[PDB]
Amino acid sequence: LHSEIGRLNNQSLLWGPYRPNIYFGTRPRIGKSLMTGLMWGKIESYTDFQHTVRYTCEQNEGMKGYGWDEYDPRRGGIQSIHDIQNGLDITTSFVKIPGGAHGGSWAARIKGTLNDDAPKDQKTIVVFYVSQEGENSELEAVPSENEFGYEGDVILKGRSEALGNYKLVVTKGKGVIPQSDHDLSRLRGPGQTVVQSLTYPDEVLWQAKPILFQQLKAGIDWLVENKYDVADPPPPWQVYLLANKPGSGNVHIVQKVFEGDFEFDILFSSESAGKEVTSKDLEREVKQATEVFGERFARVFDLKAPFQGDNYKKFGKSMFSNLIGGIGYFYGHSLVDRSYAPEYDEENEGFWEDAAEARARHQEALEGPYELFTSIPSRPFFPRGFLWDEGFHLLPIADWDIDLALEIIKSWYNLMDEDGWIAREQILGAEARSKVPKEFQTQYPHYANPPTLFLVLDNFVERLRKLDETLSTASVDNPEVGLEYLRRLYPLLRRQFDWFRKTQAGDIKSYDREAYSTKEAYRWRGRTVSHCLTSGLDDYPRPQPPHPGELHVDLMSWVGVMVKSLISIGSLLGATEDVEFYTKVLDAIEHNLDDLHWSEKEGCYCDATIDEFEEHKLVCHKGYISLFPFLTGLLKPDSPKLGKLLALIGDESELWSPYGLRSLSKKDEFYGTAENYWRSPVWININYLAIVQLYNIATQDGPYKETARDLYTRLRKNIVETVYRNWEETGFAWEQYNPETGKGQRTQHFTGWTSLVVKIMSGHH
Numbered sequence: 133l134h135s136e137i138g139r140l141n142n143q144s145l146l147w148g149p150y151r152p153n154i155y156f157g158t159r160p161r162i163g164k165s166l167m168t169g170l171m172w173g174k175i176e177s178y179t180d181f182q183h184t185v186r187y188t189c190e191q192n193e194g195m196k197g198y199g200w201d202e203y204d205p206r207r208g209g210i211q212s213i214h215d216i217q218n219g220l221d222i223t224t225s226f227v228k229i230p231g232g233a234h235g236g237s238w239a240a241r242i243k244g245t246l247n248d249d250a251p252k253d254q255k256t257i258v259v260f261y262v263s264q265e266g267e268n269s270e271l272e273a274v275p276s277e278n279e280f281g282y283e284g285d286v287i288l289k290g291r292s293e294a295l296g297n298y299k300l301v302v303t304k305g306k307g308v309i310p311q312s313d314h315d316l317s318r319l320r321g322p323g324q325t326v327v328q329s330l331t332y333p334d335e336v337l338w339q340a341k342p343i344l345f346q347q348l349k350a351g352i353d354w355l356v357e358n359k360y361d362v363a364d365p366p367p368p369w370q371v372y373l374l375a376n377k378p379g380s381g382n383v384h385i386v387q388k389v390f391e392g393d394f395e396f397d398i399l400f401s402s403e404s405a406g407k408e409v410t411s412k413d414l415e416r417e418v419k420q421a422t423e424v425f426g427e428r429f430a431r432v433f434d435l436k437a438p439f440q441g442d443n444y445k446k447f448g449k450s451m452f453s454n455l456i457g458g459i460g461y462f463y464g465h466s467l468v469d470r471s472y473a474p475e476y477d478e479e480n481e482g483f484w485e486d487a488a489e490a491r492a493r494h495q496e497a498l499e500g501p502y503e504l505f506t507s508i509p510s511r512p513f514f515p516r517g518f519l520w521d522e523g524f525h526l527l528p529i530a531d532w533d534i535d536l537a538l539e540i541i542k543s544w545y546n547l548m549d550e551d552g553w554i555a556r557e558q559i560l561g562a563e564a565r566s567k568v569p570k571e572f573q574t575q576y577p578h579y580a581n582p583p584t585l586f587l588v589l590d591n592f593v594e595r596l597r598k599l600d601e602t603l604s605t606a607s608v609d610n611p612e613v614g615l616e617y618l619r620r621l622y623p624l625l626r627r628q629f630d631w632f633r634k635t636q637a638g639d640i641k642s643y644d645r646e647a648y649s650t651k652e653a654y655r656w657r658g659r660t661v662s663h664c665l666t667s668g669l670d671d672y673p674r675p676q677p678p679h680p681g682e683l684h685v686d687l688m689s690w691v692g693v694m695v696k697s698l699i700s701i702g703s704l705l706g707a708t709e710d711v712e713f714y715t716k717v718l719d720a721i722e723h724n725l726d727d728l729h730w731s732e733k734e735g736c737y738c739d740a741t742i743d744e745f746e747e748h749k750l751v752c753h754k755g756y757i758s759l760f761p762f763l764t765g766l767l768k769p770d771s772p773k774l775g776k777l778l779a780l781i782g783d784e785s786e787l788w789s790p791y792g793l794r795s796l797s798k799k800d801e802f803y804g805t806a807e808n809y810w811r812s813p814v815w816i817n818i819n820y821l822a823i824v825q826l827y828n829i830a831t832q833d834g835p836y837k838e839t840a841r842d843l844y845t846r847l848r849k850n851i852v853e854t855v856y857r858n859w860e861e862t863g864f865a866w867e868q869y870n871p872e873t874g875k876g877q878r879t880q881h882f883t884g885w886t887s888l889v890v891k892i893m894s895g896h897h
């Protein structure tokens with residue numbers, strides 16, 4: 133019956149606007165298939181369209197804002213786009229209609245409305261671009277009656293093994309079509325919808341902007357050749373209207389020009405389903421999806437005081453929709469260095485110079501192809517899977533739709549190699565690559581990232597212990613199905629656990645280090661003089677110089693997180709021998725955190741290193757790192773150490789700002805130095821961890837209950853209000869917040885773990 137649930141999940145999730153790297157586009161969860169994308173831009177001159185056209189997501193002066201107002205990947209959503217440069221407010225509605233055997237049908241409305249500043253007669257070019265990859269696939273534009281293009285709908289008829297038969301329609305739409313009185317109109321028509329059907333090698337189909345401009349340039353060349361010149365030029369918009377040439381091919385460009393406001397529909401009808409999808413279907417199903425979104429939001433994200441007001445609701449709906457709306461399907465090769473050069477072992481002083489020499493051998497090669505279904509940090513900047521980010525993304529998503537979350541976890545775990553490594557950054561395919569500077573593309577099999585996906589698994593387990601609607605929770609409602617999922621995933625979790633212990637081992641035995649256990653000690657590979665990217669806390673100060681004898685307290689705590697998860701899942705599956713090993717490791721980590729990491733002098737956990745004189749030294753930089761055993765839930769509610777940690781957390785002159793906890797203490801010598809990435813700013817992911825743990829202590833009999841209750845109440849309020857105020861002023865979720873001013877800074881559109889704020893508001897952990 134697990135198989136039955138699987139098949140239904142497949143069919144439910146198959147279609148989506150799963151191209152979050154562009155403003156609007158669709159693809160199914162199939163590597164080589166049918167994809168769509170939208171382009172638009174004002175044209176006011178003979179050279180401006182190349183500058184105004186929109187396709188891939190950006191953020192700059194020219195774009196006021198954009199995002200999903202509502203979204204569920206099972207149903208669809210509505211997106212808003214505020215384009216200043218092009219003077220347009222755009223709505224893209226997307227809806228899915230179940231039926232047939234190929235994942236069902238879908239429809240989109242594209243609505244553009246000029247803003248108040250735009251000339252009332254602005255000419256806007258709109259393109260709908262369709263490509264299909266596959267060896268045994270076909271797609272064909274049905275030709276027009278009229279001489280020069282289309283008066284009505286453009287109909288494309290296609291077929292593939294993946295999709296069966298289907299028809300994709302781009303409706304006539306509503307709005308003024310400009311008409312040219314020029315001579316050229318005798319040969320090109322006065323102005324109408326046009327279609328060009330082209331073919332290119334499959335691997336370049338994603339390059340829509342270049343493909344389009346190539347056709348425009350061919351058009352212009354034709355003009356010059358046929359004596360259309362500056363003595364009497366056609367209007368710009370006619371110059372950039374493609375000559376109509378529909379047919380078969382693996383690329384179809386549908387182009388319309390509007391003057392003033394416009395709208396039009398895209399209808400994808402799966403043949404194996406009922407009758408074909410209509411505009412009337414679109415309208416009714418859009419209304420229906422909104423009703424269902426509304427009701428689920430109110431159940432799942434019931435915002436508690438003092439955030440129960442309508443303004444906080446709108447805020448919460450926007451943050452959540454942007455997060456879940458960011459879900460993409462990615463397909464293609466990864467760039468991996470599979471040399472396992474010995475320099476990557478980092479057993480020497482100065483290991484970072486050796487490692488750089490090894491990287492400069494460029495042994496990396498493409499491998500796969502792989503696929504991934506994942507949410508993302510950011511559409512305009514980071515539209516791809518990041519390993520420890522996805523842990524935080526899935527916490528709110530799991531509340532919404534646990535089955536969708538387990539799908540994404542499975543997607544991630546299917547990327548794991550036989551060693552137990554999953555690359556921390558998943559750049560699949562040339563499209564995905566196009567956004568990443570070369571320096572940053574190669575993955576290294578010795579680079580870890582925090583195992584945050586285990587947190588999501590813990591939430592699932594507690595829910596398990598204690599048709600779209602049915603499917604969204606099938607995995608907890610049918611305990612047989614939940615256990616089966618765990619049974620299959622469990623070995624991969626164990627493999628990753630063992631991988632951590634093998635590749636991220638620290639060195640106890642080779643120095644003068646006494647501690648309860650000789651095994652438990654950890655060091656992130658991959659550190660440079662100034663960085664430790666693999667830990668997630670890019671530039672958080674660490675022992676100088678980096679050294680093979682370093683030990684990292686955050687890493688040890690992540691291992692504790694993992695082993696606790698394995699005990700809970702192992703128990704469920706009756707893995708007796710496994711549980712007993714995990715139990716000895718938990719016990720060991722618990723003692724060793726104290727023996728190697730706890731500083732009595734400073735009253736917090738510290739990274740460790742090895743002296744000029746080969747002795748163990750604590751290196752203390754008060755900040756998120758210092759709190760880790762607490763953030764990760766490893767300390768007993770009655771612990772004196774916890775006591776000291778709560779004092780640090782609450783201390784205004786260290787970590788506690790009006791706007792949240794500082795990444796680094798104001799008293800640290802590295803406060804606000806260098807790029808100041810994790811050396812003062814307030815980060816929502818770590819604050820979220822603090823908030824959940826504070827609440828944990830507040831809701832249990834114990835000596836710190838009341839202290840925790842106070843800090844929980846204040847921190848919750850500080851974090852939410854900072855995100856909300858910024859969202860109100862700017863439209864944006866930000867990557868981090870300034871603890872002096874509360875201003876959002878770094879990257880916009882970070883939804884992104886900033887979105888955890890909906891979960892903070894709804895509370896009741």
Ligand SMILES: Cc1cc(-c2ccco2)ccc1NCc1ccc(CN2C[C@H](O)[C@@H](O)[C@H](O)[C@H]2CO)cc1
Nearest residue numbers: 509512513514518520521567568569572668669670
């Ligand atoms: C300099 C640069 C430019 C562009 C670009 C130019 C035009 C469009 O894109 C893309 C990448 C890069 N540099 C790498 C990078 C930098 C920052 C992040 C965000 N972020 C940092 C956290 O510290 C991590 O914990 C977290 O996992 C992680 C993902 O959220 C991720 C990657």
